[PDB]
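Wed. Picked up where I left off yesterday with Glutamyl endopeptidase. The coffee machine is broken again, so keeping this brief.
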Amino acid sequence: VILPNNNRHQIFNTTQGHYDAVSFIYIPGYMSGSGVVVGENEILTNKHVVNGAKGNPRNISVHPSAKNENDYPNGKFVGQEIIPYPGNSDLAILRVSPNEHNQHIGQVVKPATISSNTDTRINENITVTGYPGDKPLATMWESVGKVVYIGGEELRYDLSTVGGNAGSPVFNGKNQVIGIHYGGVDNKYNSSVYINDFVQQFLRNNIPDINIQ
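Structure written out below (tokens, as returned):
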């Protein structure tokens, strides 16, 4: 949702630095979302995003580092298996197949570093980076703000997001993923799945190369 803090800027060097793992999701109209590469064959996104495929992961296209609708520098990877988080939060792993050159998604971009969240606190400056639907299709935007709430598996912030941002990584100042954006409440806050210790266990047990720091 759009909040009084609406500080959003387009990313152009989408294959460089921590942006390469940020991914555009397209599911045939169409729905679109966001996600983040975190392992050799794996992205994180929302349940409500992968649910749009109606049980067929092959309906999901993942474009890591997408720059615009005519510029997918790392091509696409097709959904292979949906692994929902068992807990009551909007988090899923999407395992993708290798591409047409037999490259794995976590070989073409550097998988994102996950935060242990040992230091994460309210008032901390963060970003949410992904593919908002008010902007041109498949353009990457970074939104700037602060954490306002941490509780259980919920982390909320005062920065603006728009439909299409679902699944976007929430980055701390070290460019580590602290949460996965899922939506918000008009005029109040936006919300993410907080990567707490239980979420970290789920990641380790499904993504053996997960990099938690």
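Quick read: The domain at 15-112 is CATH 2.40.10.10 (Thrombin, subunit H).
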